[PDB]
């Protein structure tokens, strides 16, 4: 399949070279997989989600996304126009309040919630969790993300936006999950992206167009926006039978575009997620 005039990051993950604007993908499109977006919530009624999104859990007075961040991330996973995996099922877990903040104890509960809740849902091709959030190092937050991976969910997390080594942030620094840095449309490391040997992969992160609350759209930047490109790519490859939740991060790194990025520090991987679709 081909989507003309796609956002640049969708085009980039289906291309060997930068500067193109069509997104190529197998029409299966993640059907039969499930992606949990663990964030400020999701505006499920946005037309772009087509009834494929729903809120399953909140820790605040409401389950609605009053911020936008969680809706934008979910749109990059799975919206019809701006999403990688256009037929996947999206589940929202609201661990962050509408200012974008939340306690580590709440985020830990949300991760253990997903490891159980997947047994209540129909996801025969597999289950992914997208975590576009982070803070200072916490061994309890890292262990929670490791449990979720071990339970059989592909866990993708954002490296963080400090232009610093990600070893000092959680859950970015947890080695068993998939830690995602950000690149821009010119195949440079985004100037804010964290780096380090704990990174696994890069995805598009600067100037990313996706869904927003109030049924709108906008373009914003961060490792937050890179992470759901990889989450959606995982769900897409799992639906194709190429990989499993346990090995998807390794499979994405195996099959990535290699050596294409500039401004990569010595000792950080030079790998850019790629769906390897041969039309
Ligand atoms: Ca959410
Ligand atoms: Ca990692
Ligand atoms: Cl996310
Ligand atoms: Cl890793
Ligand atoms: Cl690369």
Coordinates of C-alpha atoms and ligand atoms in Angstrom, one line a residue:
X1 CA 0.0 0.0 0.0
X2 CA 1.0 3.6 -0.5
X3 CA -0.1 6.8 1.3
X4 CA 0.7 9.9 -0.6
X5 CA 1.7 13.2 1.1
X6 CA 2.4 11.5 4.4
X7 CA 4.1 13.2 7.4
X8 CA 7.8 13.0 6.9
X9 CA 8.4 10.6 9.7
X10 CA 6.1 8.0 8.3
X11 CA 7.8 8.3 4.9
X12 CA 11.2 8.0 6.6
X13 CA 10.5 4.7 8.3
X14 CA 9.6 3.1 4.9
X15 CA 12.6 4.6 3.1
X16 CA 16.3 4.0 2.7
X17 CA 16.9 7.7 2.1
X18 CA 15.6 10.9 3.5
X19 CA 13.6 13.5 1.6
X20 CA 10.6 11.5 0.4
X21 CA 7.0 12.0 1.3
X22 CA 5.1 8.7 0.5
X23 CA 4.6 6.0 3.2
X24 CA 4.8 2.4 2.0
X25 CA 3.4 -0.5 4.1
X26 CA 1.7 -3.9 4.0
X27 CA -2.0 -3.4 4.0
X28 CA -2.4 -5.7 7.1
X29 CA -1.5 -2.5 9.0
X30 CA -1.3 -4.0 12.4
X31 CA -4.7 -5.6 12.4
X32 CA -5.0 -8.1 15.3
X33 CA -2.4 -6.3 17.5
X34 CA -2.9 -3.9 20.5
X35 CA -1.0 -0.9 21.6
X36 CA -1.3 0.6 25.1
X37 CA -0.5 4.3 25.3
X38 CA 0.4 5.1 28.9
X39 CA 0.2 8.9 29.1
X40 CA -2.3 11.8 29.7
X41 CA -5.1 9.8 28.1
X42 CA -6.6 9.6 24.6
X43 CA -9.4 11.5 22.9
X44 CA -11.1 8.4 21.7
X45 CA -13.8 10.3 19.8
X46 CA -11.4 12.0 17.4
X47 CA -12.4 10.9 13.9
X48 CA -8.8 9.9 13.1
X49 CA -9.1 6.9 15.4
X50 CA -12.2 5.5 13.7
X51 CA -13.6 3.7 16.8
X52 CA -10.3 1.8 17.3
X53 CA -9.3 3.7 20.5
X54 CA -10.7 3.4 24.0
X55 CA -9.8 4.5 27.5
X56 CA -9.4 1.5 29.9
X57 CA -7.9 3.0 33.0
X58 CA -7.3 6.3 34.9
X59 CA -5.9 7.3 38.3
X60 CA -7.5 10.8 38.3
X61 CA -11.1 12.2 38.6
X62 CA -11.4 11.9 34.9
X63 CA -10.1 9.6 32.1
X64 CA -10.2 12.4 29.4
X65 CA -7.1 13.8 27.8
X66 CA -7.1 17.4 28.9
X67 CA -3.5 18.0 27.7
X68 CA -3.1 16.7 24.2
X69 CA 0.3 14.8 24.7
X70 CA -1.3 11.4 25.0
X71 CA -3.6 12.0 22.0
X72 CA -0.6 13.1 19.8
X73 CA 1.4 9.9 20.7
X74 CA -1.6 7.6 20.1
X75 CA -2.1 9.3 16.7
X76 CA 1.4 8.4 15.6
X77 CA 0.9 4.8 16.6
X78 CA -2.4 4.2 15.0
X79 CA -4.4 7.1 13.5
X80 CA -5.6 6.6 9.9
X81 CA -3.7 9.6 8.5
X82 CA -0.8 10.1 10.9
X83 CA -0.3 6.6 12.3
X84 CA 2.2 3.8 11.5
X85 CA -0.1 0.9 12.2
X86 CA -3.4 2.1 10.8
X87 CA -5.6 -0.9 11.9
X88 CA -4.2 -1.6 15.4
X89 CA -6.3 -1.3 18.6
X90 CA -5.3 1.5 20.9
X91 CA -5.8 1.4 24.7
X92 CA -5.4 4.4 26.9
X93 CA -4.0 4.4 30.4
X94 CA -4.0 7.8 32.1
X95 CA -1.1 7.9 34.5
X96 CA -0.4 11.6 33.9
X97 CA -2.6 14.5 34.9
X98 CA -3.6 17.3 32.5
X99 CA -0.4 19.3 33.3
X100 CA 1.6 16.3 32.1
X101 CA 2.8 15.3 35.6
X102 CA 2.4 12.2 37.7
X103 CA 4.0 10.4 40.7
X104 CA 6.3 7.4 40.1
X105 CA 4.0 5.3 42.3
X106 CA 1.1 6.0 39.9
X107 CA 3.2 5.1 36.8
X108 CA 4.3 1.9 38.3
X109 CA 0.7 0.9 39.0
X110 CA -0.2 1.6 35.4
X111 CA 2.6 -0.6 34.0
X112 CA 1.5 -3.5 36.3
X113 CA -2.1 -2.8 35.2
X114 CA -1.2 -3.4 31.5
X115 CA 0.6 -6.7 32.2
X116 CA -2.7 -7.9 33.6
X117 CA -5.2 -6.1 31.4
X118 CA -3.8 -7.7 28.3
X119 CA -5.4 -10.9 29.4
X120 CA -8.8 -9.2 29.2
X121 CA -8.3 -8.1 25.5
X122 CA -8.2 -9.7 22.1
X123 CA -4.7 -9.3 20.7
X124 CA -3.8 -12.5 18.8
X125 CA -0.9 -10.9 16.9
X126 CA 0.6 -9.4 20.1
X127 CA 0.8 -6.5 22.5
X128 CA 2.9 -3.3 22.7
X129 CA 3.2 -0.6 25.3
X130 CA 4.3 2.9 24.4
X131 CA 5.8 5.1 27.2
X132 CA 6.5 8.7 26.2
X133 CA 7.5 9.8 29.7
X134 CA 10.6 9.8 32.0
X135 CA 12.4 11.3 34.9
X136 CA 15.4 10.8 37.2
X137 CA 16.7 7.3 37.8
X138 CA 14.5 5.0 39.8
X139 CA 15.3 1.4 40.3
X140 CA 11.6 0.7 41.1
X141 CA 10.4 2.3 37.9
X142 CA 13.0 0.3 35.9
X143 CA 11.9 -2.9 37.6
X144 CA 8.3 -2.2 36.7
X145 CA 9.1 -1.7 33.0
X146 CA 11.1 -5.0 33.1
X147 CA 8.2 -6.9 34.6
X148 CA 5.9 -5.5 31.9
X149 CA 8.4 -6.7 29.1
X150 CA 8.8 -10.1 30.8
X151 CA 5.1 -10.6 30.9
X152 CA 5.0 -10.6 27.1
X153 CA 4.5 -6.9 26.1
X154 CA 6.9 -5.1 23.8
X155 CA 7.9 -2.1 25.8
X156 CA 9.1 1.1 24.0
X157 CA 10.3 4.0 26.1
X158 CA 11.5 7.5 25.3
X159 CA 15.2 8.3 25.9
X160 CA 14.4 11.8 27.2
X161 CA 15.1 15.3 26.1
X162 CA 18.1 16.5 28.1
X163 CA 20.9 16.1 25.5
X164 CA 22.5 13.9 28.1
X165 CA 23.3 10.3 28.7
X166 CA 20.1 8.4 29.2
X167 CA 21.7 6.2 31.9
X168 CA 20.5 8.7 34.5
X169 CA 16.8 8.6 33.6
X170 CA 14.0 6.0 34.1
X171 CA 12.6 3.9 32.5
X172 CA 15.0 4.9 29.7
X173 CA 17.9 3.3 31.5
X174 CA 16.3 -0.1 31.8
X175 CA 18.2 -2.5 29.5
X176 CA 15.5 -5.0 28.8
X177 CA 13.1 -2.5 27.2
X178 CA 13.4 -0.6 23.9
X179 CA 14.8 2.9 24.5
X180 CA 14.1 5.3 21.6
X181 CA 16.0 8.5 20.6
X182 CA 14.9 11.2 18.2
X183 CA 16.1 12.3 14.7
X184 CA 15.0 15.0 12.4
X185 CA 14.1 15.2 8.7
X186 CA 17.7 15.8 7.7
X187 CA 19.0 12.6 9.4
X188 CA 20.5 14.4 12.3
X189 CA 20.1 13.5 15.9
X190 CA 17.5 15.9 17.2
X191 CA 19.4 18.6 19.2
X192 CA 17.6 17.7 22.5
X193 CA 17.7 13.9 22.2
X194 CA 19.4 12.0 24.9
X195 CA 22.1 9.5 23.8
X196 CA 24.3 6.7 25.2
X197 CA 25.0 3.0 25.1
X198 CA 21.6 2.3 26.6
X199 CA 19.8 3.5 23.5
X200 CA 18.5 0.8 21.1
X201 CA 17.1 2.7 18.1
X202 CA 16.2 6.2 16.7
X203 CA 12.9 7.2 15.2
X204 CA 11.5 10.5 13.8
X205 CA 11.2 13.0 16.6
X206 CA 11.4 16.6 15.4
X207 CA 8.4 18.4 13.9
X208 CA 6.0 15.5 14.0
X209 CA 2.4 16.1 12.8
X210 CA -0.3 14.0 14.6
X211 CA -3.7 14.3 16.3
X212 CA -4.6 16.7 19.1
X213 CA -7.6 17.2 21.4
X214 CA -10.6 19.1 20.2
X215 CA -10.6 17.1 17.0
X216 CA -7.6 19.0 15.8
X217 CA -3.9 18.4 14.7
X218 CA -0.5 19.9 15.4
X219 CA 3.2 19.4 15.0
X220 CA 5.5 19.0 18.1
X221 CA 9.0 17.6 18.9
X222 CA 10.6 15.2 21.4
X223 CA 11.7 11.7 22.1
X224 CA 8.0 11.4 23.1
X225 CA 7.1 11.5 19.4
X226 CA 9.9 9.2 18.3
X227 CA 8.8 6.4 20.7
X228 CA 5.4 5.7 19.2
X229 CA 6.9 5.4 15.7
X230 CA 8.7 2.4 17.1
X231 CA 5.8 1.1 19.1
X232 CA 3.6 1.2 16.0
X233 CA 6.4 -0.4 13.9
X234 CA 6.6 -3.2 16.5
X235 CA 2.8 -3.9 16.3
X236 CA 3.0 -3.8 12.4
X237 CA 5.9 -6.4 12.3
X238 CA 4.3 -8.6 14.9
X239 CA 1.1 -8.7 12.8
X240 CA 3.3 -9.8 9.8
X241 CA 4.7 -12.6 11.9
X242 CA 8.3 -11.3 11.6
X243 CA 9.0 -11.1 15.3
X244 CA 7.5 -11.5 18.8
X245 CA 7.1 -9.2 21.7
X246 CA 10.3 -10.6 23.3
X247 CA 12.6 -10.0 20.3
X248 CA 11.0 -7.1 18.5
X249 CA 13.5 -4.5 19.8
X250 CA 16.3 -6.7 18.6
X251 CA 14.6 -7.4 15.3
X252 CA 14.1 -3.6 14.7
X253 CA 17.7 -2.9 15.4
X254 CA 18.8 -5.9 13.2
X255 CA 16.8 -4.5 10.3
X256 CA 17.3 -0.8 10.7
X257 CA 19.0 1.7 8.4
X258 CA 22.6 1.8 9.6
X259 CA 25.1 4.7 9.6
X260 CA 22.7 7.3 8.1
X261 CA 22.5 9.7 11.1
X262 CA 24.8 12.6 11.9
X263 CA 25.7 14.1 15.2
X264 CA 25.7 10.6 16.9
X265 CA 28.2 10.6 19.9
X266 CA 30.8 7.9 19.9
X267 CA 29.4 4.8 21.7
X268 CA 25.7 5.5 20.7
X269 CA 24.1 3.3 18.1
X270 CA 23.7 4.7 14.6
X271 CA 20.4 2.9 13.8
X272 CA 17.2 4.3 12.3
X273 CA 14.0 2.3 12.4
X274 CA 12.9 0.9 9.0
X275 CA 10.0 -1.3 8.0
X276 CA 11.8 -2.9 5.1
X277 CA 8.7 -3.0 3.0
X278 CA 9.4 -3.9 -0.6
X279 CA 6.3 -2.9 -2.5
Ligands
LIG1 CA1 -2.8 7.8 27.6
LIG2 CA1 17.0 -0.1 26.9
LIG3 CL1 3.8 7.0 23.7
LIG4 CL1 17.4 -2.2 25.4
LIG5 CL1 21.2 5.3 10.8

